[PDB]
Design a protein around this ligand. Structure first.
Ligand code: A1EIE
Ligand code: A1EIE
Lengths: 1322, 139, 140
């Protein structure tokens, strides 16, 4: 099993008793190692790791912020044992728990505040018992705190009564223990006369606890509020023995001090703060936590001020609010920014710097250096690139060196480092740079001699420079040198030195030193994970250290046999993320480990490791290190080495020299002499033949028959390899239009061959399923249509067509038998689109396919066919398909009946006319039949049609036996419709659609809007496409590092004009968001003056531009940054959400441009309150339907001035542009699968392309613009710009395309022309 | 060290690496820095470098697909007005006019008269000031 | 069978075209010495610096490969790196310092550090390289 084991272990690890946790963790490490085969199968058999592995990874990554050190080290070892699964394989969506977000966002005098006080003081009372000197104050503080409020459980609902209610009545028992027991108070205080005026940093305030106490007391004196003074007096003295409630009360103490007092009391607290911030540490812990608590107080101040502003919007209130607001304003935002940068609170520094730039109008140019330093410290390459793109002045050399280090170009950086050494000779960071870059290019001997030279002229430096000597040495396998260098310096703790010590102690066979150093290194690696896991997207941010734990696990398991290995190295390397930074360290350490114990085949294994390094560095673009890896991979894999050199040259563009080298190698290693049947050698022969065939196909010399014969050769060599069949079939597909004159009557048998080979490829793999299945089905069904038309035309060739169509039908039938149902599931929507095919034999074969897929997955299939089943020809055809499915399995009879009843009752709900006006309709009263139906016990369980259970998960390339059978798509939780929540919500926004909420079998509730008078088939297909793009974004390393993602809800059309859409919670359109902020500011424009501002489309462009620039833009200042400030108050969450907004807007801007998405008005763009991420809705207007509107749409996507404002002071530069470029690059790389799916979507006969005619056949409705739309989409994917207008040019580069798009979207000359409903001004 | 030459050379280097876009970006940024519109470059080598950079910008624009013809023509005319004695300006202006002539006039010589006059005029001035493109301009 | 001799001939004649021809003709996988000869003949210096370090790792007592590495560093424009590299080679082996003095003298008169040029020249009498002669003239 091991699933039960992992589940109970997951729950045991999350136990309160730390010893139970430690035992669970030890046994979990043992289990993980013993079941490594099953766990590798779980992780690698599908494109996504089984759900249990994801839960386990989250649970461990959290158990590693646990306090006990053994527990941390243990989850770290278990994360290493589990592997470094690619973050794109794991699904961390389930854990968006609130967590850090609880309650009590703002508290001043409420007894929630007092309850926090009381429980902190109960921690104190137990902290009183420490030693009695703290008794003195703790006891009386608790006593007077009890006295101040209701201290008792009086059956009267008295405020303090329900605070005793509040207390976890263990502490509440402590409170009742001595309710009135005065513990002989001190009663004593020292009045602040002659006290050190610069308190911080002198006599009584030179330590954090004492400084906090002293300043808190001086403030105690100043507050004039009757109540607050009471309890501040209360705990005056234990703030002496307590730093923590000093921390707790300081925030409110300052609020009260500033809500009104003498102006110089104000100035006193102000000078105290400014002295704390201005002061520079080293110019120890007092600095740290003094600034941290100053930030605490200022955070509380601004939060309280916002809450106050809201209260006053809903007098003495206004005066107090203005008081604290003024004190907040007096502190300079740049002082706080540099103070935060010193504290290493980088995100807070970014928040403060941005508020400084916007609030106090400042030229960003003067402050670009500080911003680049901030972004380079946060390890945010996009911010560094954005600052580089913003700067007008010429970059300094340091600013150039920073940009290169962050962007990651190491050769340019090496040149820069040399020039820097020349300019400033005695700085050591430059020698660090040059040696790091030598080590990155693989120049190890050069690194050793370089560090030796630096030592020769300066001996001081060669203790920081020793890291690189040790790394180069243990990579050269020079153990003597490693020993010398390590003995020289014991100070360095860098990862390379720890790894050198470990490998050296393994070489000497010192077991105890090895294991001690191993524990130390594991602890050091877990240290940063414990800080990273307190976050969103934590696995990806701490992936470097998870890869280090992976490496430590492999190291230990390889070393143990030496001291006195079942780990699968290939599976463990394939799980890892496809990046250079992830796979390269692993392979380097693997080569070291192979050298440590020399088996016979290690001259071959090291070569294989070098080839893997070569292929990893090539795919990433490090052609220099790729070449060095090829050089180091000496021999014993001659064929593989030639294939790698060929791919390297191809990637460098030199397709000719690549073909030459490949043909040379194929003649050298697989000579015409002998048939290679030698297993792995046969596989390499097939891969080389396929590569040669492809090269030929791109080279313009070769004939068509030569290429065809090369492909047939490969399909004959390896007849159970998908790639051969796929490339053969798609080449036949290419040459078919030319050979046959683009007349399908002759295309018959070519089509049969192509279909057959697409199906064969599918049998052995799913890697090209999105190019294979769509194309196979398209060709077959369209040849069927053609054959029918010819049959009705009477031509003589139509009998030829009948025959060849019969043969194609037979091929498709054999495919039906051999392929697995999930493979057709991936195309089910297309299959259903074609159910009204005219040819009846083609329909019989299609019905067989559909019925197979229905029997395999009746829930998904039923949800996909509901729409057509309720549509006349469509109804009849879908009814026949269902009847056949029931005949094959009669258990589906009851399920189909129950589903039809549920669905037509949901239809009645959608179309039910709301009685007059009221935003709520009760399920119990208004419907009473849907509820009964779902409540029955006989009613079959109907899956809730969320996207997770509608979109299939295809097996991975690794999985042999999971493929083509034994593979479960739709892994994970299935929630059935258990019942309906009573309340139904009518919406005034979208044209009166109800909002029912379904109760799942799991107990959770799913809000489902029941939209009417809309055809959602287009939205359904669009969600399928977006989910495919989501897979592609997950698999890409840079996309995942940025966390690019499209938020796809579920759209299920119940009928031609109805449907239920999954409600996206915690979102509001851009227009309502902005209108609320404009109303709060008091600057707003009613429909009236907007009317007077609008002018007729006849008006000349200049009039429109003047109106837009002079009235609409001035009235609407940019405020969208305040939504982020008010919604995400914490600086960490503010930063995460601001960057999430940038990335999401970018992804969806690029994808919408590709798809021609229009009508992106205010409501059609929603922003998540919790994540900040953008969500697009109303996908009706697609493929440039906007240009058809009366006021056409001339912008590629929506980027108004308020959105650009939300993006920050850098604007579209920085994160937005870089996410746009990553998305564009990825959408160009995957042009062929995306274009297959889009072709099948644009030719969908069921999608309502043309509004039905008024006067009221075949259910099909052909799309006239299908060809136009396909050509335009593929142009946009190629980079070709429609805007020729007497210009002929080459396709734009990705950067050029993105730049042109952004400048078109933000152009005011275009925006002024847009319809006003689009709200271009907002 | 007294260098907008530096920006022109960076632009040419990037264009040689194939990065025509970042070439144009760096060049237009360095033209705006070193030759702010407020003060004209009337001086000796600075007018020379201004013309060199304006021509290079026109040529980048011509290579890029998003720019449409009117702006490119205006840039070339700018160059010829800045350096009227320079040959490359006239040559490239006339070359661009020759290129966009077939499209504007539908490949019909009748409307090509006026364009042909402008083209030959600028070819001829080109020749007056240099012989570097004689085999493209005289024929 | 005789492609090694032929390629060495063409490399001695300074015919890069003959070296390229011999490279295109070989059916067997090229040696590392042949790759170094192919790269030195048809200037890459990056392919060649990779090959030189690989050779240093395989054959660590040949001064030829250190010649190659330092000459490649000098061709890229990394002068300070070249001085430090030559100083390291001199650190662990003193015999090679006289043969590698050429590159440190060149990097020194190119960096314009006349003190280093003076030292490196004073500690040499056997080098008649163009680099050293130009350095002597600039120091005079
Ligand atoms: C528009 N004309 C035709 C049409 C109509 C509706 C749809 C549609 C609706 C949704 C969908 N909307 C939301 C959503 C929307 C707005 C707001 S709001 O705060 O602006 C406030 C003003 C309501 C908040 C949340 C959340 N989840 C969803 N699934 O998806 N498609 C598509 C086409
Ligand atoms: C060091 N990395 C590991 C490794 C080592 C070797 C290989 C390999 C072998 C060949 C090969 N090359 C040529 C060839 C080369 C260059 C030229 S040339 O005229 O351009 C001029 C540059 C001389 C002309 C012909 C002819 N026959 C061949 N067998 O190609 N790649 C692959 C990986």
């Amino acid at each position: 099993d091991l699933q039960t084991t992992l589940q109970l272990s997951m729950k045991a690890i999350q136990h309160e008793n730390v010893d139970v946790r430690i035992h669970a963790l030890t046994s979990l490490k043992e289990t993980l190692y013993k079941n490594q085969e099953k766990l590798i199968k779980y992780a690698t058999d599908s494109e996504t790791v089984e759900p249990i592995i994801s839960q386990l990874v989250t649970v461990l990554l959290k158990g590693c912020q646990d306090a006990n050190s053994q527990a941390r080290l243990l989850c770290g070892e278990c994360l290493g044992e589990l592997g470094a699964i690619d973050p794109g394989r794991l699904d961390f969506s389930t854990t968006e728990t609130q967590g850090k977000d609880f309650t009590f966002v703002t508290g001043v005098e409420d007894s929630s505040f007092a309850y926090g006080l009381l429980m902190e003081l109960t921690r104190a009372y137990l902290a009183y018992a420490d030693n009695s000197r703290a008794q003195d104050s703790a006891a009386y503080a608790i006593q007077e705190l009890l006295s101040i409020y209701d201290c008792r459980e009086m059956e009267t609902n008295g405020p303090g009564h329900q605070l005793w209610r509040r207390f976890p009545e263990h502490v509440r028992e402590i409170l009742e223990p001595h309710l009135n027991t005065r513990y002989k108070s001190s009663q004593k205080s020292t009045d602040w006369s002659g006290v050190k005026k610069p308190i911080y940093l002198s006599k009584l305030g030179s330590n954090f606890a004492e400084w906090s106490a002293s300043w808190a007391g001086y403030l105690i004196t100043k507050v004039r509020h009757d109540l607050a003074s009471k309890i501040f007096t209360c705990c005056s003295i234990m703030m002496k023995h307590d730093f923590k409630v000093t921390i707790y009360l300081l925030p409110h103490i300052l609020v009260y001090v500033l809500l009104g007092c003498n102006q110089e009391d104000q100035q006193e607290v102000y000078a105290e703060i400014m002295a704390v911030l201005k002061h520079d540490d080293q110019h120890s812990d007092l600095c740290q936590l003094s600034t941290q608590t100053v930030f605490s107080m200022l955070d509380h101040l601004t939060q309280w001020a916002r809450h106050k502003f809201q209260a006053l919007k809903a007098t003495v209130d206004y005066e107090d609010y203005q008081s604290v607001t003024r004190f907040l304003d007096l502190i300079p935002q740049d002082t706080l920014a540099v103070a935060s940068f010193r504290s290493k609170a980088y995100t807070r520094a970014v928040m403060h710097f941005e508020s400084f730039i916007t609030e106090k109008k400042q030229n960003i140019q003067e402050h670009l250096g500080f911003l680049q330093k901030l972004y380079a410290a946060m390890h945010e390459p996009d911010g560094v690139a954005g600052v580089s793109a913003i700067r007008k002045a010429e970059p300094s050399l340091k600013e150039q060196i920073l940009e290169h280090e962050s962007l990651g170009l190491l050769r340019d950086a090496t040149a820069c480092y040399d020039r820097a050494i020349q300019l400033e000779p005695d700085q050591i960071i430059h020698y660090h740079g040059v040696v790091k870059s030598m080590l990155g290019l693989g120049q190890l001997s050069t690194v050793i001699t370089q560090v030796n030279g630096v030592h020769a002229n300066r001996s001081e430096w060669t203790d920081e420079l020793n890291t690189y000597r040790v790394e180069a040495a243990w990579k050269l396998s020079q153990w003597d040198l490693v020993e010398n260098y390590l003995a020289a310096d014991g100070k360095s703790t860098t990862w390379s030195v720890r790894l050198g010590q470990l490998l050296l102690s393994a070489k000497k066979r010192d077991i105890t030193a090895f294991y001690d150093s191993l524990k130390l290194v594991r602890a050091e690696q877990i240290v940063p994970l414990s800080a990273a896991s307190f976050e969103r997207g934590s696995y990806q941010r701490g992936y470097e250290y998870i890869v280090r734990l992976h490496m430590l696990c492999e190291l230990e398991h390889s070393i143990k046999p030496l001291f006195q290995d079942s780990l699968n190295w290939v599976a463990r390397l394939e799980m890892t993320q496809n990046s250079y930074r992830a796979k390269e360290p692993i392979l380097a350490l693997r080569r070291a480990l192979l050298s440590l114990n020399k088996r016979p085949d290690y001259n071959e294994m090291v070569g294989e490791c070098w080839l893997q390094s070569a292929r990893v560095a090539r795919k990433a673009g490090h052609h220099q290190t790729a070449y060095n890896a090829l050089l180091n991979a000496g021999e014993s894999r001659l064929a593989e080495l030639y294939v790698e050199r060929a791919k390297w040259l191809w990637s460098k563009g030199d397709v000719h020299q690549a073909l030459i080298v490949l043909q040379k190698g194929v003649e050298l290693c697989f000579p015409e002499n002998e048939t290679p049947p030698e297993g792995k050698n046969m596989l390499i022969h097939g891969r080389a033949m396929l590569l040669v065939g492809r090269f030929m196909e791109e080279t313009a010399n070769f004939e068509s028959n030569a290429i065809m014969k090369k492909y047939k050769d490969v399909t004959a060599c390896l007849p159970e390899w998908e790639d051969g069949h796929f490339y053969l079939a798609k080449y036949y597909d290419k040459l078919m239009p030319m050979v046959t004159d683009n007349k399908m009557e002759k295309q018959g048998d070519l089509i049969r061959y192509i279909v057959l080979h697409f199906g064969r490829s599918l049998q052995y793999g799913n890697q090209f399923i999105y190019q294979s299945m769509p194309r196979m089905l398209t060709l077959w069904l369209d040849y069927g249509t053609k054959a029918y038309e010819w049959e009705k035309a009477g031509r003589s060739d139509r009998v030829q067509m009948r025959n060849d169509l019969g043969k194609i039908n037979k091929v498709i039938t054999e495919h039906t038998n051999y392929l697995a149902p999930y493979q057709f599931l991936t195309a089910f929507s297309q299959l259903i689109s074609r159910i009204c095919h005219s040819h009846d034999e083609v329909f019989v074969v299609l019905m067989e396919i559909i019925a197979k897929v229905f029997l395999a997955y009746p829930q998904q299939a039923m949800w996909m066919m509901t729409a057509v089943s309720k549509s006349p020809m469509r109804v009849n055809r879908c009814k026949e398909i269902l009847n056949k499915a029931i005949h094959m399995k009669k258990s589906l009879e009851k399920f189909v009946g129950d589903a039809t009843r549920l669905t037509d009752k949901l239809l009645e709900l959608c179309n039910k006319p709301v009685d007059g006006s009221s935003s709520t309709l009760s399920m119990s009263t208004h419907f009473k039949m849907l509820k009964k139906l779902v409540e029955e016990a006989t009613f079959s369980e109907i899956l809730i049609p969320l996207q997770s259970v509608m979109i299939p998960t295809l097996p991975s390339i690794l999985g042999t036996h999971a493929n083509h059978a034994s593979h479960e798509p739709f892994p994970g939780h299935w929630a059935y419709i258990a019942g309906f929540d009573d309340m139904v919500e009518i919406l005034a926004s979208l044209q009166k659609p109800k909002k029912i909420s379904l109760k799942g079998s799991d107990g959770k509730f799913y809000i489902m809007m029941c939209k009417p008078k809309d055809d959602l088939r287009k939205d359904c297909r669009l969600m399928e496409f977006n989910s495919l793009i989501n897979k592609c974004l997950r698999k890409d390393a840079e996309s995942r590092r940025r966390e690019l993602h499209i938020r796809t809800y579920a759209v299920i059309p119940l009928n031609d004009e109805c449907g239920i859409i999954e409600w996206v919670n915690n979102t509001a359109g851009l227009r309502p968001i902005l209108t609320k902020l404009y109303k709060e500011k008091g600057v707003y424009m009613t429909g009236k003056e907007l009317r007077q501002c609008m002018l007729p489309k006849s008006a000349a462009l200049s009039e429109k531009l003047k109106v837009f620039r002079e009235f609409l833009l001035p009235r609407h200042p940019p405020i969208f940054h305040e939504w982020f400030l008010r919604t995400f108050p914490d600086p960490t969450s503010w930063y995460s959400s601001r960057s999430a907004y940038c990335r999401s807007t970018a992804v969806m801007s690029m994808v919408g441009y590709i798809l021609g998405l229009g009508d992106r008005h205010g409501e059609n763009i929603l922003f998540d309150s919790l994540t900040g991420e953008c969500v697009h809705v109303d996908f009706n207007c697609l493929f440039n339907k906007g240009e058809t509107f009366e006021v056409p749409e001339i912008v590629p996507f929506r980027l108004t001035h308020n959105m650009v404002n939300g993006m920050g002071p850098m604007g579209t530069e920085g994160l937005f542009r870089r996410a746009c470029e990553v998305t564009m690059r990825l959408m160009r790389d995957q042009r062929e699968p995306l274009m297959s799916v889009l072709k099948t979507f644009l030719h969908d006969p069921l999608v309502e392309w043309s509004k039905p005619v008024k006067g009221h056949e075949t259910g099909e409705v052909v799309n006239e613009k299908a060809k136009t739309h396909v050509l335009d989409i593929e142009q946009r994917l190629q980079g070709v710009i429609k805007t020729r207008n007497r210009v002929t040019g080459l396709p734009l580069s990705i950067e050029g395309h993105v730049h042109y798009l952004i400048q078109e979207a933000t152009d005011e000359n275009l925006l002024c022309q847009m319809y006003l409903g689009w709200t271009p001004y907002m």
